Design a protein around this motif. Structure first.
Motif, PDB file in Angstrom:
ATOM      1  N   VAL A   1      -2.118   7.661  -2.339  1.00 36.25           N
ATOM      2  CA  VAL A   1      -0.950   6.703  -2.180  1.00 36.25           C
ATOM      3  C   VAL A   1      -1.559   5.525  -3.515  1.00 36.25           C
ATOM      4  N   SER A   2      -0.488   4.780  -3.731  1.00 33.10           N
ATOM      5  CA  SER A   2      -0.649   3.693  -4.708  1.00 33.10           C
ATOM      6  C   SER A   2      -0.972   2.507  -4.070  1.00 33.10           C
ATOM      7  N   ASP A   3      -2.309   1.899  -4.526  1.00 31.84           N
ATOM      8  CA  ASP A   3      -2.653   0.608  -3.707  1.00 31.84           C
ATOM      9  C   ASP A   3      -2.506  -0.577  -4.833  1.00 31.84           C
TER      10      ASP A   3
ATOM     11  N   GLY B   1       0.853  -2.283   9.849  1.00 32.28           N
ATOM     12  CA  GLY B   1      -0.282  -2.829   9.103  1.00 32.28           C
ATOM     13  C   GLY B   1      -1.316  -2.752   9.684  1.00 32.28           C
ATOM     14  N   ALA B   2      -1.469  -3.324  10.832  1.00 28.50           N
ATOM     15  CA  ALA B   2      -2.762  -3.294  11.662  1.00 28.50           C
ATOM     16  C   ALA B   2      -3.253  -1.780  11.838  1.00 28.50           C
ATOM     17  N   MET B   3      -2.540  -1.057  12.386  1.00 29.84           N
ATOM     18  CA  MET B   3      -3.138   0.296  12.556  1.00 29.84           C
ATOM     19  C   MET B   3      -3.266   0.936  11.218  1.00 29.84           C
ATOM     20  N   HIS B   4      -2.559   0.964  10.184  1.00 30.42           N
ATOM     21  CA  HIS B   4      -2.977   1.235   9.020  1.00 30.42           C
ATOM     22  C   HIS B   4      -4.363   0.965   8.220  1.00 30.42           C
ATOM     23  N   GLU B   5      -4.567  -0.461   8.436  1.00 27.67           N
ATOM     24  CA  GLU B   5      -5.834  -1.195   8.281  1.00 27.67           C
ATOM     25  C   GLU B   5      -6.803  -0.369   9.330  1.00 27.67           C
TER      26      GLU B   5
ATOM     27  N   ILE C   1       0.722  -1.094   0.024  1.00 25.25           N
ATOM     28  CA  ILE C   1       0.006  -0.155  -0.029  1.00 25.25           C
ATOM     29  C   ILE C   1       1.056   1.175   0.022  1.00 25.25           C
ATOM     30  N   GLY C   2       1.986   0.945  -0.790  1.00 22.79           N
ATOM     31  CA  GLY C   2       3.019   2.190  -0.841  1.00 22.79           C
ATOM     32  C   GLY C   2       4.108   1.780   0.122  1.00 22.79           C
ATOM     33  N   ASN C   3       3.837   1.558   1.565  1.00 28.22           N
ATOM     34  CA  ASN C   3       4.961   1.084   2.479  1.00 28.22           C
ATOM     35  C   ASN C   3       4.414  -0.292   3.125  1.00 28.22           C
TER      36      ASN C   3
ATOM     37  N   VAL D   1       1.529   6.887   9.602  1.00 25.78           N
ATOM     38  CA  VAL D   1       1.971   5.497   9.716  1.00 25.78           C
ATOM     39  C   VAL D   1       2.896   5.156   8.609  1.00 25.78           C
ATOM     40  N   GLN D   2       2.428   5.579   7.332  1.00 23.26           N
ATOM     41  CA  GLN D   2       3.289   5.249   6.093  1.00 23.26           C
ATOM     42  C   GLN D   2       4.825   5.881   6.632  1.00 23.26           C
ATOM     43  N   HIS D   3       4.984   7.018   7.132  1.00 20.74           N
ATOM     44  CA  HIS D   3       6.417   7.434   7.151  1.00 20.74           C
ATOM     45  C   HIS D   3       7.072   6.595   8.551  1.00 20.74           C
ATOM     46  N   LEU D   4       5.931   6.438   9.683  1.00 15.92           N
ATOM     47  CA  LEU D   4       6.491   5.808  10.936  1.00 15.92           C
ATOM     48  C   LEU D   4       6.875   4.391  10.451  1.00 15.92           C
ATOM     49  N   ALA D   5       6.240   3.578   9.531  1.00 16.64           N
ATOM     50  CA  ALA D   5       7.041   2.470   9.114  1.00 16.64           C
ATOM     51  C   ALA D   5       8.209   2.398   8.250  1.00 16.64           C
TER      52      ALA D   5
END
Lengths: 1273, 143
Positions: A632-634, A609-613, A413-415, A653-657
């Motif tokens: 973001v690209s899926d 992943g869980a947080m982003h979902e 999902i981008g990251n 989350v994307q940056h945090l991951a």
RNA sequence: UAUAUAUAUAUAUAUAUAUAUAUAUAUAUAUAUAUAUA
RNA sequence: UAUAUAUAUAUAUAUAUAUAUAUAUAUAUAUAUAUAUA
């Protein structure tokens, strides 16, 4: 005692005063303090000549076998490492070497030396290897010696002084004289023997001397050589000798400790040797006590109330002990003895075991024995080279026994990658739990509330900080020109400073800076490796917000954070007591290194992943904390990829991951080593403060829950174990905080589980943790270890060794502190000796000696003048140290529980009242016109003659210098202010609220003429508080120091004959003590080790009141009206003002203005203001309005009910009617009760009923004056 | 984790070089040599001629407009170098503040890889023991 | 030469029984010292 | 001199712990014998 004759005259006088022979006076107080500061420290050792020792201790010459340092250090990859001698890679501590060859001579004291200027120059300029290695070795060796609150010799002098003469008996029937005596202590004899090596002409040269900049050493003659370990050995011996005396242990146990230290000192790496055989003493004693036949005694009967989430416990009697209840786990003798065989110390084990076998039944003697033996472990703050520490700790990566296969993830999902539904196991459990919590966080209008947003931003700023250099570089790199405010004299590395720079910038511009280096720090420990402090920058701390928020929700809404709310730490006390009772079986668990085992490859990826979902449920276009939604690209569908918007939370989350996957990049800059700064990344979680406890506690709880409910039943074999393992859940069987955790089993019916099943259970748990790389480090010994507290059969055991009398951590090569700070050190030092239950009479004597030395100090200008001052001894009374003997009284009548501050003064005077009045009449002419509390006898002159006022006002004076302002710097002050306000007031509504509140407030306060100048807590002053804190963190200039000394002296010399207005009024009350209250528990049952008939006063205080805090109707005032507040302001100030206004009968709009002044909206302000009432308020809640608080020393006692229905403010048959409070009693009675109980707690002996008997003025007059003072402030 | 196309990295490294043949005017070489005092070298047993401090090329760059290139050469990089070299002449460099690519002016051009080396190996006459020292960084021309 | 199985001998560990020694606790007797009464 | 109380020592009995010896059982190691395989 010829030793008493050896002391100089002033010290002999002081010893007499400490023994209770004579009332202490300022005169002798100065003479002793002065002479200590002028005579050389070696004379203290010289005193030892006059002790005819008779103990069987021999100091082997094996100590003086210095191993060459040159082979204990090397540099590779341009960093000075430790190159351990033994094949064990952990031998990274200070070796045993002769420091001598690296010494020059000082011009001031020619005998002692310091490092060669040539060596440090070459190491600095030429970066020469051997020069650097020598420098590093010298620095750390000096630092290890510096880990003391003051020079050990001074402490030894204190011990000799108090022990030079037996204390006079009081009249109390329980005042047992000391059983232990000198000439029998192996420690002192050992010190004598070892010090015999350090004399040339009967001079007793000290092996080292501590200074503010570290420690110096003495140049050895050609024949001799000084090994650094000897200095450490002396400190341990001195510390043990002091502790043994205070704990009043048998000489045999002290003998074992001496042999323990000697064996450690004999071998190389004194620190490492001690560290290896650390847990020997607790294992020999605490872990194995009642594994025999003749078991029995009395034990507490504690019950855990039904709403177990509340952690409420009830004492409900006692239980008879019998053999069926004796501990089931195997003893610890075999492994410990096997270990001791390695260091040929099996005699110690035999001695300990044989002595232990003399306590088959649980009583005071047994626990007292356990307390004493456990007090034998070394109390040294171990320190090693930070470079080795960081290299040894962060070089670990968890080993996962069943990694998540790559095919278990969806498309990116981008990251991030979501977890496939088909995957089961603990990972699935973890994924669902975090996802569910993320969902709950997703929709929550609690956030986007501007006030709450202020709380989070304000939470990020503190006086400390770090990584500012990395911040400035990274942003300058991206073309961002940050402001500067250097003229405003505040440290750049302070988190405040960087926050001010950020205030104006649009947040998204800063995103590139989160991937920046983070500095680090190290804090040493007493019984383990040093801790780590890893402060993130403000931006990184902001980005990680979702991680914290979800973790908080998991904690607060599942197992109620397992006490991580930390509201009062004492809630764990009854918990472990209950957990250690015979009917319950408890198991101690803790993650081996939770900080080092949490990682991205297994853990963090799942969480991300869980947080982003979990955030998918929510408006895809909803910025959060200034982070806008993005595209973001899926790529989940290989046939239909596309791009879609995602909310700001998901962008975080994307940056945090991304950051977690990249791993933290630290930069080490240790000062003890020489020119060796570098940076290296690691997956180790920062875990620098309580902000990490939330994440680890959440994961800790999750894995445990899955293990109990799923893994264990599917895998265990014993049917009985399955039967009992079921019907068990974490919310009523498990608690934790960070790595630490407690697991307690359901009560086996009148029986105990087979150790066989236990072994099966514990084994499976180890394997379960091994699956995902958690070493569980469990143990089962029928004891309670939680947050460094120890309980045995419902009795708390203070581990005194963790609070060494002499030891103190220092994390820098320089102490970097000024003389008056030593006083606060003394105060804090004394309290520990009260918290831990020591011999209260002897501990008090030692404390005063420490105070006397600390009472005096001086300073010198960098080039110019010197300055000096010292306090009258009455200061320490105000600071909270009971006096030993007042003129006209009998020594040792004041209990250690005497409250500090005005309360202690009032109670002392109240007891001392009649003697003072009568004596003043005989000695002095009457004063010229009548006095409210005194007759014409004029006691105030007598008090001045005693210097009471001097001490009373001296203690009020500040003790840290103040930095000075400047006007162009004030432009930076304004710039700092403006930006801090800008950072604080991101929106406009809050600013409008505060401005309106402030404008209305001053308008009301002046027009209504309540008063003017009332410093009311308001948000506009929060930046001011921050600025002051930031400027204060700087090293002060000398001029400020000179101002302090001059101001202090003037405050001392100024003749004043009045206390504060409150204390003046408080003296108008007369309080008397009746009979003893009915007992709380059976005196037979021990509750705290050492609080026994031998240590009478503690034994009295605990027995009468009972330890278990059981405020069934009081709640100790924790229901503050303003649950949500911003940092900087004080809640205790806010409610005090509100109640004060309510008592003054201010109109409602006054409350509205005050509430609006701290951001509360008008509607909620009215809602809050309505709640304010004198009825629902608690005794302490209302009594605090005049700064009458509960001493910290009382926090371990059940004082609620006593204050409620044992301190009679108006007994009909006793009180004079003049003292009848009448209608104002609604707010008068709590004040009187607080005064009464304070006086009752002051005196020694059993707790008695406290009764107001008379107020010299009418109660109405007292109330009126109080209202005036309340209106004034 | 989500992996990226490796082509983007290749484009960042080799991309600029591919445009070289399209250019019309010749290139101009540069470097940011860091000095080295002769004292520490001699103190480490090295035999070196001449008093002037030695200097070592850390990284070479390319431009084509000498005018602006000189105009951009006056910046003082806030990144020190921690030079280390063994007796075997294995030479190493380390920037205490990491040197970021975006800090490089976009008119420059860097090689994909580079090896640090003495600017004038004939200055030294004998390698003593291993050596370490710190120095500033300064872009400079070369001929 | 090696591996595996069985038997016998020896050493070490654990359990049970018996004997001896040492330590601790309780009871009884005797001696000595101190206090109180006669 | 007698009685009573307290302390210490010695003797005897009972209980508990530890050590040592002997016997029996179980486990592990080593040696020897026999069988089987290579």
């Amino acid at each position: 005692e010829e030793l008493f004759n050896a002391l100089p005259q002033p010290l002999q006088q002081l010893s007499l005063a400490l023994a209770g022979e004579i009332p202490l006076t300022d005169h002798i107080f100065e003479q002793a303090a002065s002479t200590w500061h002028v005579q050389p420290r070696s004379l203290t050792y010289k005193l030892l000549d006059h002790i005819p020792f008779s103990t069987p201790v021999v100091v082997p010459p094996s100590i003086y076998h210095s191993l060459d340092w040159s082979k204990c250090f090397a540099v590779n990859q341009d960093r000075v490492e430790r190159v351990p001698t033994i094949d064990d890679p952990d031998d990274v501590y200070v070796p045993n070497s002769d420091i001598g060859p690296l010494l020059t001579s000082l011009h001031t004291i020619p005998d002692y030396g310091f490092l060669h200027p040539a060596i440090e120059n070459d190491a600095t300029t030429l970066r020469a290897e051997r020069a650097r290695c020598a420098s590093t070795f010298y620095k750390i060796a000096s630092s290890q010696a510096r880990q003391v609150k003051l020079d050990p010799i001074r402490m030894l002098g204190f011990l000799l002084l108090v022990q030079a003469r037996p204390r006079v008996p009081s009249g109390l029937v329980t005042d047992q004289p000391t059983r232990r005596d000198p000439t029998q202590s192996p420690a002192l004899h050992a010190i004598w023997q070892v010090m015999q090596y350090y004399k040339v002409a009967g001079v007793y040269y000290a092996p080292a001397l501590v200074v503010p900049s570290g420690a110096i050493w003495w140049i050895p003659p050609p024949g001799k050589r000084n090994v650094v370990s000897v200095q450490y050995l002396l400190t341990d011996l001195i510390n043990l000798a002091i502790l043994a005396h205070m704990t009043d242990m048998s000489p045999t146990l002290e003998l074992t400790g001496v042999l323990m230290y000697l064996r450690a000192a004999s071998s190389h790496s004194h620190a490492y040797t001690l560290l290896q055989m650390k847990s020997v003493f607790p294992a020999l004693s605490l872990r194995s006590m009642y594994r025999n036949k003749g078991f029995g005694g009395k034990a507490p009967a504690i019950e855990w109330t039904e709403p177990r989430s509340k952690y409420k416990f009830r004492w409900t009697g006692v239980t008879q002990l019998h053999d069926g209840l004796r501990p089931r786990s195997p003893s610890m003798d075999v492994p410990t003895l096997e270990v001791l065989t390695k260091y040929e110390l099996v005699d110690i084990g035999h001695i300990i075991i044989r002595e232990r076998n003399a306590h088959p039944r649980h009583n005071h003697d047994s626990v007292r024995f356990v307390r004493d033996v456990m007090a034998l472990t070394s109390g040294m703050y171990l320190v090693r080279q930070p470079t080795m520490s960081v290299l040894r700790e962060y070089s670990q990566v968890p080993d996962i026994k069943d990694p998540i296969p790559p095919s278990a993830w969806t498309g990116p999902i981008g990251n991030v990658r979501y977890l496939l539904p088909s995957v089961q196991g603990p990972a699935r459990h973890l994924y669902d739990t975090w996802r569910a919590a993320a969902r709950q966080i997703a929709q929550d209008p609690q956030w986007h509330d501007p006030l709450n947003q202020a709380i989070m931003r304000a939470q990020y700023v503190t006086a400390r900080g770090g990584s500012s250099a990395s911040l400035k570089f990274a942003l300058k790199v991206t073309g961002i020109v940050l402001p500067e405010y250097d003229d405003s004299k505040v440290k750049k590395s302070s988190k405040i400073y960087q926050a001010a720079q950020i205030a104006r910038i649009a947040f998204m511009l800063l995103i590139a800076a989160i991937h920046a280096e983070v500095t680090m720090g190290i804090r040493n420990q007493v019984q383990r490796r040093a801790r780590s402090i890893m402060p993130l920058n403000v931006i990184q701390q902001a980005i990680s917000a979702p991680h914290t928020l979800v973790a908080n929700y998991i904690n607060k809404h599942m197992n109620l954070s397992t006490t991580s709310g930390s509201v009062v730490t004492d809630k764990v006390i009854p918990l472990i007591l209950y957990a250690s009772t015979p009917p319950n079986t408890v198991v101690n668990v803790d993650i081996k290194a939770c900080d080092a085992s949490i990682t991205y490859n297994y853990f963090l990826s799942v969480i991300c992943g869980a947080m982003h979902e979990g955030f998918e449920v929510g408006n895809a276009d909803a910025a959060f904390m200034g982070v806008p939604s993005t595209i973001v690209s899926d790529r989940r569908s290989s046939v239909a990829p596309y791009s879609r918007p995602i909310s700001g939370l998901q962008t975080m989350v994307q940056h945090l991951a991304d950051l977690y996957a990249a791993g933290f990049r630290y930069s080490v800059s240790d000062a003890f080593s020489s020119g060796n700064k570098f940076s290296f990344p690691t997956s180790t979680f920062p875990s620098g403060s309580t902000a990490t406890s939330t994440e680890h506690t959440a994961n800790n709880s999750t894995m445990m829950e899955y293990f109990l409910n799923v893994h264990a039943p599917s895998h265990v074999k014993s049917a009985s174990l399955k039967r009992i393992l079921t019907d068990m859940t974490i919310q009523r069987n498990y608690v934790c905080q960070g790595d630490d955790g407690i697991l307690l089993l359901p009560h086996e019916a009148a029986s105990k589980i087979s150790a066989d099943d236990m072994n099966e259970l514990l084994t499976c748990l180890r394997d379960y943790g091994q699956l995902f790389g958690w070493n569980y480090d469990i143990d089962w010994s029928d004891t309670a270890e939680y947050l460094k507290l120890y309980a045995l059969m419902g009795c708390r055991i203070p581990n005194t060794s963790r609070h060494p009398p002499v030891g103190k951590e220092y994390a820098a090569p320089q102490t970097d502190e000024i003389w008056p700070s030593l006083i606060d050190i003394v105060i804090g030092h004394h309290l520990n000796g009260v918290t831990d239950v020591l011999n209260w009479r002897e501990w008090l004597r030692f404390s005063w000696a420490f105070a006397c030395y600390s009472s005096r100090g001086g300073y010198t200008n960098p080039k110019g003048q010197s300055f000096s001052a010292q306090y009258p001894w009455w200061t320490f009374v105000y600071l909270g140290i009971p006096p030993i003997l007042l003129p006209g009284q009998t020594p040792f009548i004041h209990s250690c529980y005497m409250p500090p501050g005005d309360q202690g003064m009032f109670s002392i005077l109240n007891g001392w009242r009649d003697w003072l009045i009568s004596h003043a009449s005989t000695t002095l002419p009457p004063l010229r016109h009548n006095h409210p509390v005194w007759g014409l006898s004029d006691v105030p002159s007598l008090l001045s003659q005693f210097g009471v006022y001097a001490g009373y006002h001296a203690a009020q004076h500040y003790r840290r210098p103040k930095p000075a302002p400047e006007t162009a710097s004030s432009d930076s002050i304004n710039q700092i202010t403006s930006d801090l306000t800008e950072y604080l007031f991101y929106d406009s509504a809050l600013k409008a609220r505060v401005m309106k509140g402030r404008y209305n407030w001053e308008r009301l306060s002046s027009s209504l003429s309540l008063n003017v100048g009332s410093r009311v807590p308001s948000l506009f002053d929060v930046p001011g508080k921050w600025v002051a804190a930031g400027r204060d963190a700087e090293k002060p200039p000398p001029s400020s120091v000179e101002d302090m000394f001059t101001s202090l002296n003037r405050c001392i010399r100024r003749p004043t004959h009045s206390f504060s207005r409150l204390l003046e009024l408080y003296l108008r009350v007369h309080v008397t003590l009746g009979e003893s209250i009915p007992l709380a528990i059976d005196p037979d049952v021990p509750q705290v080790a050492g609080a026994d008939p031998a240590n009478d006063d503690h034994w009295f205080k605990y027995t009468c009141l009972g330890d278990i805090p059981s405020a069934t109707r009081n709640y100790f005032g924790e229901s503050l009206f303003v649950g949500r507040v911003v940092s900087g302001l004080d809640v205790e100030a806010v409610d005090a003002t509100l109640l004060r206004l309510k008592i003054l009968g201010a109109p409602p709009e006054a409350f509205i203005a005050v509430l609006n002044g701290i951001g509360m909206s008008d509607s909620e302000a009215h809602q809050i203001a309505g709640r304010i009432s004198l009825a629902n308020a608690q005794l302490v809640q209302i009594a605090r309005v005049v700064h009458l608080s509960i001493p910290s020393s009382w926090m371990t006692l059940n004082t609620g009910p006593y204050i409620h229905h044992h301190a009679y403010d108006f007994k009909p048959g006793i009180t004079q009617p003049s003292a009848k409070s009448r209608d104002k009693s609604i707010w008068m009675s709590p004040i009187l009760k607080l005064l009464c109980t304070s006086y009752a707690m002051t005196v020694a002996g059993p707790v008695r009923t406290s009764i107001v008997t008379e107020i010299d003025g009418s109660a109405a007059a007292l109330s009126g004056n109080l209202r005036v003072w309340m209106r004034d402030v | 984790l989500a992996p990226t196309p490796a082509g983007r990295l290749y484009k960042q490294l080799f991309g600029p070089w591919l445009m070289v043949p399209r250019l019309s005017d010749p290139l101009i070489k540069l470097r940011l040599v860091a000095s080295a005092p002769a004292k520490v070298l001699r103190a480490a047993g090295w035999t070196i001629d001449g008093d002037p401090p030695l200097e070592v090329s850390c990284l070479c760059a390319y431009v084509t407009d000498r005018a602006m290139a000189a105009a951009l050469i006056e910046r003082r990089l806030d990144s020190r170098a921690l030079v280390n070299v063994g007796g075997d002449q294995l030479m190493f460099v380390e920037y205490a503040p990491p040197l970021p690519l975006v800090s490089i002016p976009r008119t420059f051009l860097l090689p994909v890889t580079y090896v640090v080396h003495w600017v004038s190996p004939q200055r030294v006459l004998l390698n003593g023991g291993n050596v370490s020292f710190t120095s500033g960084l300064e872009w400079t021309f070369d001929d």
